[PDB]
Amino acid sequence: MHIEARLFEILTAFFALAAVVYAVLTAMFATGGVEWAGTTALVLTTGLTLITGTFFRFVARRLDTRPEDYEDAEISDGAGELGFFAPHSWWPILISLSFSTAAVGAALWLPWLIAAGVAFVITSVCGLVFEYYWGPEKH
Amino acid sequence: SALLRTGKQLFETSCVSCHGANLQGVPDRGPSLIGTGEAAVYFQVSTGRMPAMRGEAQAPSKPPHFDESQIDALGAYVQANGDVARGGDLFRLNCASCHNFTGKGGALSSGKYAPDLGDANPAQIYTAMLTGPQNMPKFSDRQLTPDEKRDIVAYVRESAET
Amino acid sequence: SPDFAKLAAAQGDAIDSRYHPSAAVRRQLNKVFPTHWSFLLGEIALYSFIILLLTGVWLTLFFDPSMAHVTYDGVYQPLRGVQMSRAYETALDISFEVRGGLFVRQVHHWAALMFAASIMVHLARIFFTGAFRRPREANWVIGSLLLILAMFEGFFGYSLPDDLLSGTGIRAALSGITMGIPVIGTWMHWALFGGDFPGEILIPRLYALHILLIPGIILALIGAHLALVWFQKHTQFPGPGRTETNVVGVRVMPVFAVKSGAFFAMITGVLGLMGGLLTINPIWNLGPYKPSQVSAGSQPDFYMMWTDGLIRLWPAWEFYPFGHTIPQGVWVAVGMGLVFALLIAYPFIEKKVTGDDAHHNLLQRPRDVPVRTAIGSMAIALYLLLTFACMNDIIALKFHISLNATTWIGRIGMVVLPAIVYFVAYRWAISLQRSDREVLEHGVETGIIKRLPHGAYVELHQPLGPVDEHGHPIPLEYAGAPLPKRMNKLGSGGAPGTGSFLFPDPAVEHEALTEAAHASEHKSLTALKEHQDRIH
Amino acid sequence: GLIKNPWKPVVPTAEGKKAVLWTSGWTPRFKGETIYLARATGRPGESPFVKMRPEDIDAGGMETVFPWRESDGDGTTVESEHKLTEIAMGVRNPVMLIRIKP
Amino acid sequence: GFGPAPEGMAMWIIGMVAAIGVAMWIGSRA
Amino acid sequence: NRPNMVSVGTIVWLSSELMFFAGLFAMYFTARAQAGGAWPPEPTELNLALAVPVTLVLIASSFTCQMGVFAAERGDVFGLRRWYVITFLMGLFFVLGQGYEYIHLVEHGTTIPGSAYGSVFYLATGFHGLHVIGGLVAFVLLLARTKMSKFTPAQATAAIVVSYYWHFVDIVWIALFATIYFVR
Ligand SMILES: CCCCCCCCCCCCCCCCCC(=O)OC[C@H](COP(=O)([O-])OCC(O)COP(=O)([O-])OC[C@@H](COC(=O)CCCCCCCCCCCCCCCCC)OC(=O)CCCCCCCCCCCCCCCCC)OC(=O)CCCCCCCCCCCCCCCCC
Ligand SMILES: CC(C)=CCC/C(C)=C/CC/C(C)=C/CC/C(C)=C/CC/C(C)=C\CC/C(C)=C\CC/C(C)=C\CC/C(C)=C/CC/C(C)=C/CC1=C(C)C(=O)c2ccccc2C1=O
Ligand SMILES: CC(C)=CCC/C(C)=C/CC/C(C)=C/CC/C(C)=C\CC/C(C)=C/CC/C(C)=C\CC/C(C)=C\CC/C(C)=C/CC/C(C)=C/CC1=C(C)C(=O)c2ccccc2C1=O
Ligand code: HEC
Ligand code: HEM
Ligand code: HEM
């Protein structure tokens, strides 16, 4: 899983090179002081590819060569199970409607419909999360 | 003080038709007074669809838009809550785009002049500045201190009278 | 010393010697009712009606219904020295000068709204599941009068305080619609007012109707309505042991005397919270009804909102056929009188259209009737459109749309929107049927993929019955079953390990509470299986 | 018992006791009654109807005015019944004294 | 508005939700 | 030998919320440099008391949340439940602790209008206040989810990724504590 992690360790080597150079060249050459609105988003976009980048490094250092990482592996190596994949669910339609009724109210500034929209999000995020964990009924 | 019995009966006679603490459906309603006080809720909004209750150059008469004692009483009922030259220049900077030129940002024909403001006075201007207007953001507390509001109101008043 | 066993045996021998309710009571107790969540929707309208009794008998110990004028001189400071009716001053004495009278007043209005909401939710259970068929035609008709009487009971209720907001509703409805009826004219307008509006005998006539005359017909109809579902027995959805002549469910004495008594405690507990927390009708903000005044939000309650929304949507269509005139209000009095005619006489215009006139005891699942689901959801979409055009001034101010364009999305929408809800529900109810045939032909579509050794991603469906050497198993028949779509609802989740939320049990008491729990449901499964094979 | 005639002559106008719904308070009792366009001074329950000059409002009036008998006054209990039947017991009295800009 | 319209809206999303949501816990699904 | 998809799908997402707090820091520093002539709290005083005894609770919350996620990897369904109720009640002490700090700074100092510092304080620490309340929701929706199934390795994986969200909220607050109270 080496070149999944190296793809995020080239970007954080460039952005650290593009945040040191940008902070220095706006420290001595900007018309005022150090410009902060651009060097903030570059020190934290080499933080994007460092939270993600160093996590893929810890995983590629723990895992062995999986059948994707081998050069010419036969197709009969993935004989096991893939995992779980939700085949159908009407919960993503009711989280999008519930988050778009807390954003209409955030736009029109209706506090009775933001708080009715946040409560529709939680009662529908509960539906999507709990969907494959209920058990039968007790009657 | 203003008589709240008169204020309630005036609300019922003249404002209940569009306002039950809610706003009139037709066009845009005035809505609930924000930071309700005599200074802003008292100051009328002749501009726009809303009718002008106070009439300039009006002697005491039975048919009238509003009564000085009636206005104060209703403004109070709604409000339950349960360097002059230096000031004018500052107002132009903050409101330079619309106030500057004494004109109106929304309508070129509309102006901040006394004919446009009818029966204007310093208190009416100060009050609309404090909470601003229906289409203008309020300035008190949020943006400008009392001296600044007082100075900008005086500058606008002197510019319009002259 | 008390005993309560010999004292309760000699009391039962005393009742059975005076009277003899032995065989009479046991058949009532051994009555079997189906356990289903939808079958409790009619009990909310039965339990909200008892709360309207108990908080309405209280509320008439303090209300004076006259219209005689009197100044206030009481306790509310804005309304001091205002010429009001005595119906409005005592409605301000309940709110202010009676200890906890504002609470019982607010509970009584929310119990009025939970009543008239759960009649509408109960009509939708009866309509879509088809409980109005052959034996229960007249129980629809006894029922659908209780909905019409609940419209006018509530409308005569909030018109008793003589509010400014609630007095212009009488001037709009009872004085505008009744004045332009072409059938008899304005002769009725002097017969329900005693003169010109407001008159003097309006509210004492609306206090007589609203206490004895209409709740004496509602309680008489309810008594002829729950005593139909008791004796022609309750319907049931089809399932394992449900064969059109059984009632599979639970009895009355140990169970359903508890879960229908504890549900009455929880409906009343909601109206206790809603009646105390949420304010419902402040009649002290807007003052008394004086005809010179005006209120910017003159709207009825939600059960009467579709009548106000119907007046706003009809365009200004008058006739003038002679020297006389015909106003716009004829289109509502024949519009209200046609909605009430196609809602009472619905089961007789489906015996004529479909021709299915056989004795039906099993309900039919509302995806299996694609047309009447689509006729029904057409009617909700037409009801929801009228009640969102009566509050268009609140849609104008808050939602920032218009006040002119909210009728043109209503009047154009009154034809267009119930035409495309018919198409998006007839093609929805059929596609729910096709989802029930994929879980029978192939099986419960779980999530596990398992790449085969030659590629070939599969999904390892669960067969739901007998298997075969062929790939898909033997296909079952439908027979109105609910057909579970997910594998956790079948036996694949498992118990989380018994114990507290923080500390476990010592695992000798865990294997005993899961061996005797997977065998106490397996005993429940072979019970119906050995009863379904006895019938068939 | 509860069926009344809407066209019985009740209101004594100058045209020979015309019926209700053709009388709206502004119908003169005799030839020269001269009903004044009188406004209310706020809270019109116990408020005396002051008169109105035509120059009282500048532009955009919105003054709800009422009929005034010019014999009532205020203070006495005999003539206070004339102002209780003026507004609360009398519908289709109030009119809008709207002023148009020149 | 503060009359019957936000009160009628608060009936269906608070009252009838907590009157149907109770019945789905007392009752069954069949 | 498969790299735990839901854990990868969260830390890929948790790098986006760092950029959500990149546009909220960039509002703070540009209203400190190009607007602060004096020190940026001019009419207010930031007290480290009630700001240090609520940031020592989040650090100890990560010391108890990580002890919960050790119980999910072993199989202790009840050890997972014990150390998240500690994490829930100490995260709720942070919302109630900082929520009392906001009331102390409105009726005494700068509200969110009327102050240049008043907008870059109630939004930098404000959207952190909604990533804790939004995080405590995810503890209720996880501990109640452990009451419904047999505690699979998918129940443990769902407790890995809620733990990663809480350590992210914990580290972002250190980037807010060591920014607005110390680098005033
Ligand atoms: C903002 C306004 C809010 C005001 C509140 C008003 C809301 C109405 C009340 C809702 C009442 C619901 C029923 C209650 C009785 C049942 C109780 C029960 O346990 O039965 C189990 C029941 C299943 O039992 P079952 O029938 O025997 O099992 C059969 C199978 O399981 C069956 O399997 P399945 O496949 O069939 O799935 C069934 C399940 C499918 O699961 C789900 O879909 C969702 C499950 C969770 C739903 C509830 C989550 C939270 C509730 C609202 C929270 C609001 C927060 C924001 C509020 C802001 C206010 C300022 O569906 C349901 O059970 C129906 C639930 C109905 C959803 C309620 C929608 C709320 C409307 C929001 C209105 C907003 C108000 C706006 C007004 C503004 C001002 C004017 O499951 C539930 O219903 C759970 C509901 C729990 C809600 C009670 C409150 C939660 C308190 C817990 C907090 C914990 C604190 C910290 C703890 C520490 C760690 C643990
Ligand atoms: C004011 C008021 C209450 C009036 C009610 C009086 C009234 C108008 C009644 C209507 C009379 C009608 C329409 C009767 C038709 C019934 C009918 C078709 C009978 C056919 C005969 C038959 C099937 C068998 C013959 C044997 C027979 C009649 C009776 C045997 C049992 C005996 C001896 C007595 C039963 C009498 C009795 C205790 C009845 C109680 C029934 C009632 C009203 C229960 C109330 C009730 C409650 C309280 C619920 O909570 C509930 C919750 C969920 C679902 C339903 C109910 C429900 O029905
Ligand atoms: C099912 C039915 C109505 C069949 C009619 C049969 C038929 C063919 C009749 C012909 C006559 C015609 C054409 C009648 C047209 C309909 C009409 C004018 C009157 C009928 C009135 C009536 C019986 C209506 C019943 C429909 C109704 C109110 C509810 C059923 C909806 C269902 C199935 C479930 C409700 C689910 C539920 C509790 C949701 C709560 C949350 C939501 C989404 C609430 C939506 C909502 C609603 C539903 C409001 O009523 C409302 C009113 C005021 C303010 C706000 C709201 C609001 O938000
Ligand atoms: C006793 C006080 C009072 C009464 C009575 C009153 N208004 Fe207003 N109105 C205001 C105030 C104060 C504003 C300024 C907006 C605000 O409050 O923010 C206003 C603003 C308006 C506006 C918006 C003007 C703008 O430019 O923003 C309209 C339209 C309006 N009113 C219409 C009416 C109509 C129509 C009536 C009666 C038929 C009426 N008003 C009666 C106090 C009143
Ligand atoms: C919309 C008006 C109504 C109609 C058309 C109607 C019709 C029906 C029908 C056909 C049944 C069939 C029996 C079954 O479901 O198997 C029924 C049941 C029932 N109804 Fe109604 N009904 C209405 C309103 C009411 C009201 C207002 C109440 C409250 C008193 C009520 C109480 C009940 C009860 C208790 C039952 C039996 C169990 C239940 O479904 O709750 N109904 N109704
Ligand atoms: C035993 C039968 C009933 C009696 C004696 C009764 C009595 C009363 C009384 C005295 C009021 C007083 C008005 C006020 O308090 O301001 C009232 C109000 C009301 N009633 Fe009833 N009622 C009964 C049944 C019902 C029913 C069945 C409904 C359902 C439609 C209903 C709906 C209302 C409403 C909406 C109000 C107005 C509440 C308010 O003023 O805020 N009532 N009732």
TrEMBL record, chain B:
Q: Which GO terms describe its molecular function?
A: heme binding; iron ion binding; quinol-cytochrome-c reductase activity
What keywords does the record list, in alphabetical order?
Cell membrane, Electron transport, Heme, Iron, Membrane, Metal-binding, Repeat, Respiratory chain, Signal, Translocase, Transmembrane, Transmembrane helix, Transport
Main location (coarse class)? membrane
Catalysed reaction, written as an equation: a quinol + 2 Fe(III)-[cytochrome c](out) = a quinone + 2 Fe(II)-[cytochrome c](out) + 2 H(+)(out)
Metal-binding as UniProt keyword: yes
Task: Write down the membrane topology.
Answer: Multi-pass membrane protein
Q: Where does heme c 1 bind?
A: 15, 18-19, 50, 134
* Residues where heme c 2 binds: 44, 49, 95, 98-99
Keyword Signal annotated: yes
Q: What is its EC number?
A: 7.1.1.8
Broad enzyme group: translocase
Q: How is it modified after translation?
A: Binds 2 heme c groups covalently per subunit.
Q: Where in the cell is it found?
A: Cell membrane
Full protein: residues contained: 47 to 229 of 268
- Annotated Cytochrome c domain ranges read 2-82, 83-160
This protein's GO cellular component annotations are: plasma membrane
Assembly and interaction partners = The cytochrome bc1 complex is composed of a cytochrome b (QcrB), the Rieske iron-sulfur protein (QcrA) and a diheme cytochrome c (QcrC) subunit.
The top of its lineage is: Bacteria, Bacillati, Actinomycetota, Actinomycetes, Mycobacteriales
Write out the residues that bind heme c 3: 49, 95, 98-99, 134, 136
The name on file for this protein is Cytochrome bc1 complex cytochrome c subunit
From TrEMBL, chain C:
- What InterPro entries does the record point to? Cyt_b/b6_N (IPR005797), Cytb/b6-like_sf (IPR027387), Di-haem_cyt_TM (IPR016174)
Positions of heme b 2 binding: 105, 108, 210, 281
Domain (Cytochrome b/b6 N-terminal region profile) spans 11-238
The EC number(s) this enzyme carries:
7.1.1.8
Q: Which cofactor does it need?
A: heme
- Which positions does UniProt annotate for heme b 1 binding? 42, 122, 125, 225, 234-235
Please give the biological process terms from Gene Ontology that the record holds: respiratory electron transport chain
Mind telling me which Pfam families this protein's record contains? Cytochrom_B_N_2
The keyword Transport belongs to this UniProt entry's keyword annotation: yes
Q: Give membrane topology per the record.
A: Multi-pass membrane protein
UniProt KW keywords: Cell membrane, Electron transport, Heme, Iron, Membrane, Metal-binding, Oxidoreductase, Respiratory chain, Translocase, Transmembrane, Transmembrane helix, Transport
Q: Which GO terms describe its molecular function?
A: metal ion binding; oxidoreductase activity; quinol-cytochrome-c reductase activity
**TM ranges:** 37-63, 107-128, 140-160, 172-194, 206-231, 261-280, 329-349, 369-388, 408-429
Top-level taxonomic group: Bacteria
Locations listed in the record = Cell membrane
One GO cellular component term noted in the UniProt record for this chain:
plasma membrane
Enzymatic class = translocase
PROSITE patterns per the UniProt record, alphabetical: CYTB_NTER (PS51002)
Q: Which reaction does it catalyse?
A: a quinol + 2 Fe(III)-[cytochrome c](out) = a quinone + 2 Fe(II)-[cytochrome c](out) + 2 H(+)(out)
Protein function:
Cytochrome b subunit of the cytochrome bc1 complex, an essential component of the respiratory electron transport chain required for ATP synthesis. The bc1 complex catalyzes the oxidation of ubiquinol and the reduction of cytochrome c in the respiratory chain. The bc1 complex operates through a Q-cycle mechanism that couples electron transfer to generation of the proton gradient that drives ATP synthesis. The cytochrome b subunit contains two ubiquinol reactive sites: the oxidation (QP) site and the reduction (QN) site.
Name of the encoding gene: qcrB
From TrEMBL, chain D:
- Domain of life according to the entry: Bacteria
Query: Where is this chain's protein located in or outside the cell?
Result: Cell membrane
Q: Which family does it belong to?
A: Belongs to the Rieske iron-sulfur protein family.
Q: What does this protein do?
A: Iron-sulfur subunit of the cytochrome bc1 complex, an essential component of the respiratory electron transport chain required for ATP synthesis. The bc1 complex catalyzes the oxidation of menaquinol and the reduction of cytochrome c in the respiratory chain. The bc1 complex operates through a Q-cycle mechanism that couples electron transfer to generation of the proton gradient that drives ATP synthesis.
Write the protein's name.
Answer: Cytochrome bc1 complex Rieske iron-sulfur subunit
Organism classification? Bacteria, Bacillati, Actinomycetota, Actinomycetes, Mycobacteriales
Q: Which residues of the full protein are shown?
A: 205 to 306 of 408
From TrEMBL, chain F:
Q: Which keywords has UniProt assigned to this entry?
A: Cell membrane, Membrane, Oxidoreductase, Translocase, Transmembrane, Transmembrane helix
Q: Which InterPro entries match?
A: Cyt_c/ubiquinol_Oxase_su3, Cyt_c_oxidase-like_su3, Cyt_c_oxidase_su3-like_sf, Cyt_c_oxidase_su3_a-hlx
What stretches pass through the bilayer?
Answer: 5-28, 48-71, 83-100, 120-144, 156-183
GO biological process assignments: aerobic electron transport chain
Q: What is the lineage of its organism?
A: Bacteria, Bacillati, Actinomycetota, Actinomycetes, Mycobacteriales
Name the enzyme's class.
Answer: translocase
Return the Pfam families for the record.
Answer: COX3 (PF00510)
* Claim: Transport is one of the keywords in the record: no
Q: Which PROSITE patterns match?
A: COX3
Lipid bilayer topology: Multi-pass membrane protein
- Protein name, entry field: Probable cytochrome c oxidase subunit 3
Gene3D superfamilies per the UniProt record, alphabetical: Cytochrome c oxidase, subunit III, four-helix bundle (1.20.120.80)
